[PDB]
Amino acid sequence: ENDNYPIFTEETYTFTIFENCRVGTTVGQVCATDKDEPDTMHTRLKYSIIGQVPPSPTLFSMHPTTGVITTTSSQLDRELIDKYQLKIKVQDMDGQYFGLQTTSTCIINIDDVNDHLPTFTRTSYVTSVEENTVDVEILRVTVEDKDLVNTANWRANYTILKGNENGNFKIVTDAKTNEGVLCVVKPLNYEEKQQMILQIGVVNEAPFSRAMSTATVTVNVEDQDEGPECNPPIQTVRMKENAEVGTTSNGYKAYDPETRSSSGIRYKKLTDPTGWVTIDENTGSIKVFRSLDREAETIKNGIYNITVLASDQGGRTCTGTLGIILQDVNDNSPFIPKKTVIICKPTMSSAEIVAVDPDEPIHGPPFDFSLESSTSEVQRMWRLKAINDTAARLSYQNDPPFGSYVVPITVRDRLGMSSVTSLDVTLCDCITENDCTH
Amino acid sequence: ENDNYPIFTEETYTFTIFENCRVGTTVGQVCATDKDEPDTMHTRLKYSIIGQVPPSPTLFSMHPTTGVITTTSSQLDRELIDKYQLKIKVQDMDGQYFGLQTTSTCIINIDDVNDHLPTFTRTSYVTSVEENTVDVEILRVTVEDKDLVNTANWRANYTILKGNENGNFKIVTDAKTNEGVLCVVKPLNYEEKQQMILQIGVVNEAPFSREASPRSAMSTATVTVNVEDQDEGPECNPPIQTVRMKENAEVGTTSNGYKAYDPETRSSSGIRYKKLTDPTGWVTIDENTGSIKVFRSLDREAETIKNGIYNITVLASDQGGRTCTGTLGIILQDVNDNSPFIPKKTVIICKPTMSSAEIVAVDPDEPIHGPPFDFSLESSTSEVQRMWRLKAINDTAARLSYQNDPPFGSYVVPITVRDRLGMSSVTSLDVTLCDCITENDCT
Ligand SMILES: *[C@@H]1O[C@H](CO)[C@@H](O[C@@H]2O[C@H](CO)[C@@H](O[C@@H]3O[C@H](CO)[C@@H](O)[C@H](O[C@H]4O[C@H](CO)[C@@H](O)[C@H](O)[C@@H]4O)[C@@H]3O)[C@H](O)[C@H]2NC(C)=O)[C@H](O)[C@H]1NC(C)=O
Ligand SMILES: *[C@@H]1O[C@H](CO)[C@@H](O[C@@H]2O[C@H](CO)[C@@H](O[C@@H]3O[C@H](CO)[C@@H](O)[C@H](O[C@H]4O[C@H](CO)[C@@H](O)[C@H](O)[C@@H]4O)[C@@H]3O)[C@H](O)[C@H]2NC(C)=O)[C@H](O)[C@H]1NC(C)=O
Ligand SMILES: *[C@@H]1O[C@H](CO)[C@@H](O[C@@H]2O[C@H](CO)[C@@H](O[C@@H]3O[C@H](CO)[C@@H](O)[C@H](O[C@H]4O[C@H](CO)[C@@H](O)[C@H](O)[C@@H]4O)[C@@H]3O)[C@H](O)[C@H]2NC(C)=O)[C@H](O)[C@H]1NC(C)=O
Ligand SMILES: *[C@@H]1O[C@H](CO)[C@@H](O)[C@H](O)[C@H]1NC(C)=O
Ligand SMILES: *[C@@H]1O[C@H](CO)[C@@H](O)[C@H](O)[C@H]1NC(C)=O
Ligand SMILES: *[C@@H]1O[C@H](CO)[C@@H](O)[C@H](O)[C@H]1NC(C)=O
Ligand SMILES: *[C@H]1O[C@H](CO)[C@@H](O)[C@H](O)[C@@H]1O
Ligand SMILES: *[C@H]1O[C@H](CO)[C@@H](O)[C@H](O)[C@@H]1O
Ligand SMILES: *[C@H]1O[C@H](CO)[C@@H](O)[C@H](O)[C@@H]1O
Ligand SMILES: *[C@H]1O[C@H](CO)[C@@H](O)[C@H](O)[C@@H]1O
Ligand SMILES: *[C@H]1O[C@H](CO)[C@@H](O)[C@H](O)[C@@H]1O
Ligand SMILES: *[C@H]1O[C@H](CO)[C@@H](O)[C@H](O)[C@@H]1O
Ligand SMILES: *[C@H]1O[C@H](CO)[C@@H](O)[C@H](O)[C@@H]1O
Ligand SMILES: *[C@H]1O[C@H](CO)[C@@H](O)[C@H](O)[C@@H]1O
Ligand SMILES: [Ca+2]
Ligand SMILES: [Ca+2]
Ligand SMILES: [Ca+2]
Ligand SMILES: [Ca+2]
Ligand SMILES: [Ca+2]
Ligand SMILES: [Ca+2]
Ligand SMILES: [Ca+2]
Ligand SMILES: [Ca+2]
Ligand SMILES: [Ca+2]
Ligand SMILES: [Ca+2]
Ligand SMILES: [Ca+2]
Ligand SMILES: [Ca+2]
Ligand SMILES: [Ca+2]
Ligand SMILES: [Ca+2]
Ligand SMILES: [Ca+2]
Ligand SMILES: [Ca+2]
Ligand SMILES: [Ca+2]
Ligand SMILES: [Ca+2]
Ligand SMILES: [Ca+2]
Ligand SMILES: [Ca+2]
Ligand SMILES: [Ca+2]
Numbered sequence: 001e002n003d004n005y006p007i008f009t010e011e012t013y014t015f016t017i018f019e020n021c022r023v024g025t026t027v028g029q030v031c032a033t034d035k036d037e038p039d040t041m042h043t044r045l046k047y048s049i050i051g052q053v054p055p056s057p058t059l060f061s062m063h064p065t066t067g068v069i070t071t072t073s074s075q076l077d078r079e080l081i082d083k084y085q086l087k088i089k090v091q092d093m094d095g096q097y098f099g100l101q102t103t104s105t106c107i108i109n110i111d112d113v114n115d116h117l118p119t120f121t122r123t124s125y126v127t128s129v130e131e132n133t134v135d136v137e138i139l140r141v142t143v144e145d146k147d148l149v150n151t152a153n154w155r156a157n158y159t160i161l162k163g164n165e166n167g168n169f170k171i172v173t174d175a176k177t178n179e180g181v182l183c184v185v186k187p188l189n190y191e192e193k194q195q196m197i198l199q200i201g202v203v204n205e206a207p208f209s210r211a212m213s214t215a216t217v218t219v220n221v222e223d224q225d226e227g228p229e230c231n232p233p234i235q236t237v238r239m240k241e242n243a244e245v246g247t248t249s250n251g252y253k254a255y256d257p258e259t260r261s262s263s264g265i266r267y268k269k270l271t272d273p274t275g276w277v278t279i280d281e282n283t284g285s286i287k288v289f290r291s292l293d294r295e296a297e298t299i300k301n302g303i304y305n306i307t308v309l310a311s312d313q314g315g316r317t318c319t320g321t322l323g324i325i326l327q328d329v330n331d332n333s334p335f336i337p338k339k340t341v342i343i344c345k346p347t348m349s350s351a352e353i354v355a356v357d358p359d360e361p362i363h364g365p366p367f368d369f370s371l372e373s374s375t376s377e378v379q380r381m382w383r384l385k386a387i388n389d390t391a392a393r394l395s396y397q398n399d400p401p402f403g404s405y406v407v408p409i410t411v412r413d414r415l416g417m418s419s420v421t422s423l424d425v426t427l428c429d430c431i432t433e434n435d436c437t438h
Numbered sequence: 439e440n441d442n443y444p445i446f447t448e449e450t451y452t453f454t455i456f457e458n459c460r461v462g463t464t465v466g467q468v469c470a471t472d473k474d475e476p477d478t479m480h481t482r483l484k485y486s487i488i489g490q491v492p493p494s495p496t497l498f499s500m501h502p503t504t505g506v507i508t509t510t511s512s513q514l515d516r517e518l519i520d521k522y523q524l525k526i527k528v529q530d531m532d533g534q535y536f537g538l539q540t541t542s543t544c545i546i547n548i549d550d551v552n553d554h555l556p557t558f559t560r561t562s563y564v565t566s567v568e569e570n571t572v573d574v575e576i577l578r579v580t581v582e583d584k585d586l587v588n589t590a591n592w593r594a595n596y597t598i599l600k601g602n603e604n605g606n607f608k609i610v611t612d613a614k615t616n617e618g619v620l621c622v623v624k625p626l627n628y629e630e631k632q633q634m635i636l637q638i639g640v641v642n643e644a645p646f647s648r649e650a651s652p653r654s655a656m657s658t659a660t661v662t663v664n665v666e667d668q669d670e671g672p673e674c675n676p677p678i679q680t681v682r683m684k685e686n687a688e689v690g691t692t693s694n695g696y697k698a699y700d701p702e703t704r705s706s707s708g709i710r711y712k713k714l715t716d717p718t719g720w721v722t723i724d725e726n727t728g729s730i731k732v733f734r735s736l737d738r739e740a741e742t743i744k745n746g747i748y749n750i751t752v753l754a755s756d757q758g759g760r761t762c763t764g765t766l767g768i769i770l771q772d773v774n775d776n777s778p779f780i781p782k783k784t785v786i787i788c789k790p791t792m793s794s795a796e797i798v799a800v801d802p803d804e805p806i807h808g809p810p811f812d813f814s815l816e817s818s819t820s821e822v823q824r825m826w827r828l829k830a831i832n833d834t835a836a837r838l839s840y841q842n843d844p845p846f847g848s849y850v851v852p853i854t855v856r857d858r859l860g861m862s863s864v865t866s867l868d869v870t871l872c873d874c875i876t877e878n879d880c881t
Binding site for chain 1: 492
């Protein structure tokens, strides 16, 4: 005789399921303990649903033996009905009408899924930002989403779909308010582009379930009155090295980006390693003060560089480099770098002598070597003939003896600029040229 | 049983209204034709609005019968929302649910009115201009105006309210960019005024929205213009300077000449002078000091001089090579060193129609050193003094009469005239007492 009731484990169960879920979705399982004798009618339990709130339609089904609740429809919608309440019944004696019974409450809440795409509150946006500004928000767009707040199905994830080729802008999302903020991350240039059109899009963090919203934003760049710019950063001018003192020339030129004019700009010299020219403060033109020299040792590549400081009346500054190309003038004769030559009597018959002209090639080789300025006594026992455009060979004539001589070699360039250089020639008894102690 | 849908005349209407318009403003009218039996329920049409974008608030209401759209609020703002799109529906059978229906779109654009006053983006401006410069822009001010670009509700219309009394400055508005441009149109002088403060103002071409009650809430801005100093050359102020010098000065006596100064320094150092014009050549200029030195004796009564003032023009120059010209007026203070004189040496008196001639004397010196003159026949023989009388008719006009009976012919009468202080002069006159009639026939 079962003189005992079967009681549900929980007075009020609570389960959770997702909306739009497949039918047959296991919601949860109830169980009941029976103090009576195991494994006989007296403890064989049966489970059922007795009430549902809201009542219709029927959306939940109980299994008679196991006590498992399941959905019967996909018509679960969090945005319409978030919670259902059930009263359940367990009856012993295999569920026969004369079986003992208990009741219990059973809560079912519907959790959210991302089935609403987020949408911009406006179709188009417009903002205006100053040029040469960076790391600032210039616009805030706000979005609509019908899903559950403060969840991955709700909060937005913005992107710039088109228009951000140069990477000037960045869009990010505020966690505090879920609106998107458009930020400038590279400065803009009104003289390059006065207006920039972008297209933004928005999705949630969570992927869509079961056509993304878009909006165009035109950003108008504002012109600010800027100072002088030294473009190009490197300018060059030509000037004859034999230019007369007082002769002027265009110097560095800087212009205003707005006006595109050079007026009002005052110049000033920074670096100058030679100090041949001066700058007119008002015009920026340069005037020769001391004679130029393309072949000077302070010069390299025959180019003479000074740095200049441009400034407008507003007080903003700009620095450039003026390269003064010194046009060559044939004002240097060739010369022989190595003044001492060693000739071996039993293994050599001549030496190689090379010359150099500081001027540019047009005003240098081919060189003509001669012994014109020489005594009658060396010109009988010394020959030279050019082996190429810059070098010649000095051979010994008429059986000369061992000893240190002195040979005056005259070298002249293509245009007749002449130079004589006395060489200390030694005709010792060398063999490898590295053993000549004479 | 009518079996016809009502189709809108236009698939997508388009209307326009002004922002801030009264409620009940007619926006436009939609219509639909029903290709069906006329004048029974089977064709009596009903119109409605089914959607509005943006949705809230409801801003337009349709008339069920006429199809006229009207505004329901004055809260239409072009600067917030410029365009609305709504979907409309027309249904036959008098709008009963079993009535046939079609839909159509209706775009509504908001037109602009001037309800934002333009305002300077800065409250105060400062600029710097070079002196003795003109016809150049010295400042560009920009304004904020939220109204519709390139319209009379937007573009600015500038004025200099105060500070521009001498008319040095001019403001105009740039057509391309709507910023105001401040131009200098009369040159400035750093030595008079180093700084000039003015106040500018701005309005639109169009007046502020009609029912406005702000009086003048017009935007204004102060502009400080700092004049820049130029290193200028010598100034000949006054352009005419004057100096006094005794007419009887000894040769070699010096005196201050023309004086020019630097506008910045107010000093005369470094300035070298040079003579330009001098019609007489009595004085010379010291190139370094500008002082003048007498080279030949002066003469107030010389004919190259007029009004007893002896003028040379001078060229002042500073060490830089820039110039300045002035006029030095040398006052020759008179010294009584001249006796009276006879203007005309031959008088023709008619014996049968006149009894005397008029003889006037002239003293080159100043009035104080001249009349009244005393005429006399002192140096004359006893022989003319019997047949010639003279008495002054006034202080300088005098008369020569014949009292005895002389014969017709040319004589010589020496009239000695002396001045107020006794400088005397004797002058022989060829007086002819021929038998003339009108003074014009005596040979
Ligand atoms: C004023 O400015 C001008 C222009 O910049 C400058 O003229 C240049 O000088 C450089 C040397 O500093 C030259 O560059 C060389 O070119 C040759 C051939 O192209 C190369 O063989 C060189 O290579 C060596 O040096 C390099 C230096 O960067 C190294 O990187 C490299 O590893 C090698 O060691 C070098 O590139 C250049 O040709 C000239 N330009 C002209 C037009 O002649 C001039 O020197 C400046 N004035 C002064 C007084 O400095
Ligand atoms: C006209 O004739 C003269 C006389 O022959 C000639 O002068 C010679 O030019 C050569 C260049 O080919 C010079 O050779 C150099 O010698 C030194 C040591 O002596 C070396 O360090 C040099 O560089 C070496 O480095 C290279 C990089 O690895 C090696 O691969 C290479 O083998 C080089 O050897 C170079 O050898 C020679 O010294 C001069 N002679 C004299 C006396 O100065 C000149 O070139 C001719 N002119 C023309 C236009 O042909
Ligand atoms: C050297 O410079 C000085 C001044 O720098 C100059 O002295 C002036 O010369 C002018 C010559 O035109 C004189 O002008 C005359 O002044 C007398 C006295 O007041 C007047 O009666 C004269 O009247 C005539 O001209 C008038 C002109 O408007 C007519 O309206 C009138 O009807 C008469 O025709 C005439 O104005 C002047 O008086 C002097 N003195 C001054 C200005 O103090 C001097 O003449 C220069 N040297 C030489 C050689 O001229
Ligand atoms: C936002 O979307 C981009 C691609 O659309 C993705 O790479 C990124 O991880 C997303 N951010 C978050 C926080 O989910
Ligand atoms: C400029 O201002 C004046 C005075 O305020 C006004 O009458 C005029 O209409 C404005 N616009 C033009 C184009 O002149
Ligand atoms: C003095 O005499 C002359 C003679 O012509 C006359 O012109 C002048 O008016 C007279 N009166 C005077 C100077 O008061
Ligand atoms: C079982 O429990 C409640 C009381 O807790 C009863 O009122 C009801 O019959 C339920 O089914
Ligand atoms: C759950 O709650 C209901 C009331 O809402 C009770 O009647 C039931 O017995 C269980 O305690
Ligand atoms: C103008 O700009 C340069 C930097 O390029 C500075 O060196 C100068 O002081 C002024 O700021
Ligand atoms: C002149 O000076 C600036 C620094 O003041 C440099 O950065 C520039 O490149 C120019 O050489
Ligand atoms: C009118 O009505 C229907 C419902 O909005 C639309 O599908 C149709 O394209 C037109 O807009
Ligand atoms: C007018 O509006 C839209 C176009 O923007 C249409 O899709 C709609 O059906 C109505 O005809
Ligand atoms: C003096 O002379 C200079 C020229 O040397 C002029 O420029 C100036 O106007 C004044 O006449
Ligand atoms: C010297 O020259 C000036 C012009 O610079 C004249 O104004 C002046 O009258 C004098 O002749
Ligand atoms: Ca039991
Ligand atoms: Ca849903
Ligand atoms: Ca959802
Ligand atoms: Ca969502
Ligand atoms: Ca720029
Ligand atoms: Ca700019
Ligand atoms: Ca500008
Ligand atoms: Ca500028
Ligand atoms: Ca040289
Ligand atoms: Ca050279
Ligand atoms: Ca040469
Ligand atoms: Ca019909
Ligand atoms: Ca407005
Ligand atoms: Ca306005
Ligand atoms: Ca407006
Ligand atoms: Ca001045
Ligand atoms: Ca000055
Ligand atoms: Ca000066
Ligand atoms: Ca005199
Ligand atoms: Ca006198
Ligand atoms: Ca006198």
